[PDB]
RNA sequence: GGCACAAGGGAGCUUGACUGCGAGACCAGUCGAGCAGGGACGAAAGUCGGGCUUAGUGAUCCGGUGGUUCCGCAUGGA
RNA sequence: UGAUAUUGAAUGUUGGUACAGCUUGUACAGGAUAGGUAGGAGCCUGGCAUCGGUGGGAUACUACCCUGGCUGUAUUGACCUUCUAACCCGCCGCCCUUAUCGGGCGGGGAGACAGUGUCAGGUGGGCAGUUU
């Protein structure tokens with residue numbers, strides 16, 4: 001499929017153009033550093049029903065070398081490299097520095113000029129012929145002007161389950177993902193906050209395709225009073241809604257922090273399969289009964305989720321990394337499973353017989369409604385008599401009658417009707 | 418090792434020869450926003466200026482001293498040929514057309530652009546006055562006298578400084594190479 | 596329930612599937628001739644803001660969606 | 674855990690910054706794969722030189738700032754290893770004085786550390802304000 005990439009110095013509204021191409025994916029803010037740290041992928045079409053889009057960060061002379069490397073890598077796969085530049089400020093030395101790479105790149109290049117929001121000063125498309133490229137074009141993300149001609153200029157050169165990953169910042173999420181698809185795809189830095197939004201990639205494993213997304217970490221709500229840079233957290237929360245398997249990552253060197261329990265709450269309340277994951281065993285000791293020290297401690301603190309399997313692996317030394325997916329596939333089935341109506345009812349009155357302590361609440365019927373998560377409805381004389389202690393009791397029996405491992409369960413109650 | 422004076426270097430670039438005395442000046446991109454690039458008429462001062470005048474503006478262009486104006490479009494004569502001569506100026510109406518239709522001014526340094534005072538409605542006043550962050554400026558000849566290049570470098574430096582770029586902070590002066 | 600001259604189902608034209616108000620009704624909104632410019636058209640007449648009627652998440656607080664003498668700080672610049 | 678002040682000297686290591694003086698920047702082509710950025714007015718002191726050249730860049734020589742390095746100059750920083758003079762003694766002797774308070778004068782021990790005043794995370798139902 002065709003590949004198209006956008007490059008240039010920062011603050012030229014590259015991500016703005018990328019978004020109005022389709023939807024609203026990349027975060028759009030106005031500041032010199034607030035650029036997309038790495039490359040992203042998407043799909044597009046204009047009368048060809050087939051195109052792909054790639055967005056990167058700004059290029060200049062903190063960390064900028066990794067962004068430059070990503071921009072260079074994106075220049076490889078792209079068929080045409082839309083090269084967007086400001087119009088109001090004319091040209092710049094950094095523009096020539098950017099143009100040097102394109103000069104050394106033997107691929108077709110289309111030049112575009114942004115910040116042309118009205119007709120009159122649209123006539124400012126001049127002096128860009130010195131760059132050595134073809135005819136420039138006008139575009140404005142605020143009003144979507146000149147889009148058809150630009151897309152025609154691009155066209156003239158025309159030739160599965162999703163699982164997420166969350167956690168508190170600086171626990172190795174980015175290192176874990178790029179040490180798993182076995183390549184460099186996302187950035188890794190010592191300072192917290194390296195990632196700035198969701199990164200999506202697709203891949204096939206054991207003749208099965210998969211989708212993996214990173215979420216740049218999550219910190220406490222109270223102390224997140226940043227300069228709208230926490231606007232990315234909304235993007236991270238969005239990925240959970242589109243994901244169906246959630247991987248929570250905890251550091252092994254550090255103990256269980258209170259914020260980790262809160263983060264795991266969001267996944268549980270969303271009715272999504274969870275697999276608790278811990279990283280960085282290279283720091284703390286690996287020995288006998290050190291397995292159970294954190295294995296037991298997690299159970300004591302993380303009571304609300306017990307179905308989640310516990311996996312240990314360190315991304316730095318690549319120990320037991322290949323064991324992550326075996327957990328994932330098993331969790332995939334249990335989140336979408338139905339049990340027979342006959343069998344499910346037969347188990348219900350066995351539980352209530354040995355516990356005849358529900359006037360007295362009456363159980364009459366039981367069945368399943370949804371596949372994911374497995375919702376069940378029980379017809380009773382009155383749902384007011386239902387007690388949260390007894391409601392939890394029903395869940396344990398169901399979770400013990402069958403496997404139902406690594407997935408939450410919800411029980412609904414209906415009146416006599 | 419020694420930085421000479423202005424009154425000594427004009428008499429000494431007589432001796433650095435009929436050659437042309439030119440000035441380099443290192444400016445102080447970060448500052449591209451307030452960059453320093455430009456042209457000004459000169460005091461102590463052969464070109465061939467060809468104009469792209471449109472409408473009535475050709476009628477005052479043929480009497481000021483220009484060599485060839487045109488038949489309102491000779492970019493087709495520019496295509497496959499066109500030994501360009503000295504200087505290309507234009508007017509703010511056909512500039513957009515000449516820019517797109519003309520595809521031979523980028524790496525040749527004659528593309529009309531109204532940032533330089535060369536694309537305007539005053540074509541009669543424009544013919545008569547033309548005849549990494551660095552600026553080059555020809556101020557004159559070897560055969561000029563000692564009092565000519567002093568006013569020439571004074572006028573060009575006052576033009577540079579008159580234009581004290583925004584973000585004036587930090588040193589503005591780095592080097593003068595006569 | 597109902598549309599036979601069809602309230603399917605299509606398009607050549609693919610927007611009179613747009614432009615300024617609106618007498619007058621029904622019910623907080625909705626309906627509706629007239630109707631001023633320009634006319635999608637159709638050859639001319641003439642039609643004219645599309646799924647039948649049809650529930651389709653929102654005030655509180657009020658934060659984006661299109662820009663302009665739209666304006667006053669001692670005046671002028673922002 | 675971090676800064677900052679209280680807060681010192683010596684040598685050893687030791688970077689950064691600034692000002693200097695020398696070097697590098699690999700263009701099909703092109704005078705050795707010996708830079709962009711203003712170019713075009715010289716040999717014969719062993720050699721051979723001098724236009725110009727598919728070249729976007731040759732200089733029959735006039736004539737600026739960069740980029741990475743190498744040498745000096747100053748600034749400071751980071752450190753180690755010491756010392757001593759603040760700062761600290763619920764250690765000893767003497768005097769206030771008859772006094773397990775306190776304060777002076779001597780020894781000793783620690784010594785730029787700890788302790789103290791203003792700025793980040795976690796911690797932890799530590800203790801409050803709260804309603805569903």
Ligand SMILES: Nc1nc2c(ncn2[C@@H]2O[C@H](COP(=O)(O)OP(=O)(O)NP(=O)(O)O)[C@@H](O)[C@H]2O)c(=O)[nH]1
Pocket residue numbers: 008009010011012013014015016017027028029030031034035036056057058114115116117139140141142143
């Ligand atoms: N007036 C105006 N502003 C625009 C336009 N397009 C973008 N901007 C402004 O430019 C800002 C920066 O754009 P953004 O897409 O965030 O660029 P970026 O995140 O730096 N990505 P990149 O560095 O690759 O260019 C936006 O916040 C917006 O205010 C436009 O057409 N008109």
Ligand SMILES: Nc1nc2c(ncn2[C@@H]2O[C@H](COP(=O)(O)OP(=O)(O)NP(=O)(O)O)[C@@H](O)[C@H]2O)c(=O)[nH]1
Pocket residue numbers: 168169170171172173174175176187188189190191192193194195214215216217279280281282283314315316317
């Ligand atoms: N000891 C150890 N260190 C690791 C491991 N994985 C990463 N690190 C280091 O710890 C830091 C974590 O980097 P990163 O993957 O970006 O963690 P993150 O910030 O939580 N992810 P993101 O960048 O997406 O926000 C980096 O400095 C990395 O070098 C690991 O398995 N063990």
